[PDB]
Amino acid sequence: ESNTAGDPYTDYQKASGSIDKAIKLEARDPLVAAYPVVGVGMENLIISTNE
Amino acid sequence: VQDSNGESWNTGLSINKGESAYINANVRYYNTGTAPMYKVTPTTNLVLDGETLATIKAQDNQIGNNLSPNETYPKKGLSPLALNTMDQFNARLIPINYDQLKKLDSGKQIKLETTQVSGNYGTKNSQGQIITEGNSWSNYISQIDSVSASII
Amino acid sequence: ESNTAGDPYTDYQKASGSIDKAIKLEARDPLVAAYPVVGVGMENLIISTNEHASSDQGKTVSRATTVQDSNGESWNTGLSINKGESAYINANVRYYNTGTAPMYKVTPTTNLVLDGETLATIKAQDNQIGNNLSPNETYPKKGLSPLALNTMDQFNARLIPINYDQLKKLDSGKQIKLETTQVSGNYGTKNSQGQIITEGNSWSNYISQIDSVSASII
Amino acid sequence: HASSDQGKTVSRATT
Ligand SMILES: [Ca+2]
Numbered sequence: 001e002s003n004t005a006g007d008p009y010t011d012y013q014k015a016s017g018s019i020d021k022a023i024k025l026e027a028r029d030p031l032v033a034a035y036p037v038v039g040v041g042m043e044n045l046i047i048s049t050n051e
Numbered sequence: 052v053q054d055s056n057g058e059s060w061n062t063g064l065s066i067n068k069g070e071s072a073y074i075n076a077n078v079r080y081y082n083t084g085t086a087p088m089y090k091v092t093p094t095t096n097l098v099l100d101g102e103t104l105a106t107i108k109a110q111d112n113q114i115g116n117n118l119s120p121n122e123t124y125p126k127k128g129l130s131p132l133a134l135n136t137m138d139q140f141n142a143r144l145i146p147i148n149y150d151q152l153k154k155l156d157s158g159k160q161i162k163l164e165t166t167q168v169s170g171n172y173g174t175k176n177s178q179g180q181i182i183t184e185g186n187s188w189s190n191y192i193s194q195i196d197s198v199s200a201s202i203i
Numbered sequence: 204e205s206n207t208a209g210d211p212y213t214d215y216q217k218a219s220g221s222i223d224k225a226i227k228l229e230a231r232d233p234l235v236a237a238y239p240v241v242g243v244g245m246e247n248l249i250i251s252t253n254e255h256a257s258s259d260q261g262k263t264v265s266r267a268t269t270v271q272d273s274n275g276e277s278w279n280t281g282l283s284i285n286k287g288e289s290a291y292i293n294a295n296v297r298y299y300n301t302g303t304a305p306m307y308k309v310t311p312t313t314n315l316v317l318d319g320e321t322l323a324t325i326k327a328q329d330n331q332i333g334n335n336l337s338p339n340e341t342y343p344k345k346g347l348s349p350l351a352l353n354t355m356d357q358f359n360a361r362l363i364p365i366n367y368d369q370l371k372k373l374d375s376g377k378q379i380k381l382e383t384t385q386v387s388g389n390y391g392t393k394n395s396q397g398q399i400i401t402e403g404n405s406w407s408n409y410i411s412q413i414d415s416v417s418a419s420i421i
Numbered sequence: 422h423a424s425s426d427q428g429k430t431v432s433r434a435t436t
């Protein structure tokens with residue numbers, strides 16, 4: 001497999017570090033996947049009553 | 052022969068019952084993975100008392116360009132976004148009818164839940180420019196999820 | 204035949220497992236088709252009746268002379284309704300995948316039926332599209348609330364209307380049914396560089412071709 | 422477009 005972890009980057013790209021420099025160090029091991037986990041959290045809510 | 056002097060003052064208040072109020076959510080994005088997401092555009096459900104009021108996808112006003120791991124959009128010292136509209140061109144406000152407004156004028160709260168997030172990853176093209184346009188993260192989500200173990 | 208099963212993947216790509224890793228393993232047999240089976244199920248429906256309610260008050264003072272004094276009050280309340288645009292419909296739905304392949308960019312088309320007539324035929328626009336849908340899964344996922352099918356416009360700006368007769372027979376024993384007429388989505392292939400591309404890859408190009416060379420088992 | 426309206430009124434006049 002060229003992509004052991006299944007992410008868009010190959011084993012050599014990851015191990016060699018020749019990827020996005022913002023990827024965590026963890027994810028330059030070919031067994032740990034470069035994978036973002038995004039979540040939204042609401043702060044407050046506003047109600048405009050249109051009378 | 053007669054005279055007269057009159058005077059009056061009316062006051063009125065009308066309402067629509069299918070467009071009784073507009074909702075504005077203040078949200079913030081988080082990233083707890085190992086890779087940054089470009090052009091972050093989440094999709095969220097607004098749930099009120101067991102029924103979904105609206106499912107909103109992030110349009111241009113609410114898209115975050117960069118989201119590095121362990122960071123938030125907007126950044127730590129800024130105020131949250133305004134999840135304000137529901138249409139494609141950011142020109143249509145999120146409505147609620149009269150019964151939802153009446154139960155919302157009580158202990159009932161609106162919950163927000165992320166149903167999905169789409170974004171881009173970065174690659175270097177033929178000449179060494181980083182490209183993050185045709186590189187959709189949602190092409191690899193199922194494939195990474197199916198060949199791995201999850202740790203938190 | 205390079206594609207015995209009639210799916211986007213050849214015999215070697217299937218047999219050697221050199222395909223999307225989310226494909227079920229049975230679908231890597233050249234005789235079993237990689238094939239998503241997506242359906243929509245409504246969970247509840249919400250009616251927003253758009254009547255214009257009104258209310259006003261008043262006071263009056265008057266003095267006449269030929270001496271005469273008067274004072275009065277008043278209050279009025281009204282209700283207006285359009286009979287072709289009597290209410291708005293909001294269906295909470297959820298997509299299921301019971302096939303062998305994941306579908307990307309799921310876009311279902313659904314009829315909303317009430318007492319033997321289709322009120323609307325809605326195709327999922329940006330707010331209702333599911334990015335990923337793996338086999339034996341749902342969108343939204345198991346622990347989340349269902350979507351909201353609010354709009355019929357292409358740009359998610361026109362709400363789904365019902366007229367006065369449908370609204371009156373909807374506040375009775377009659378229920379609205381939802382049925383999926385078709386689902387359009389994408390499949391994944393690797394281009395020159397090992398990047399997965401799911402954009403020019405339509406599943407509908409293969410549906411009618413898989414349904415004509417195969418036997419169905421459920 | 423249908424509409425239905427109701428209203429009340431009280432008064433008092435002194436000579
Ligand atoms: Ca390798």
Ligand SMILES: [Ca+2]
Nearest residue numbers: 204205206214
């Ligand atoms: Ca063959």
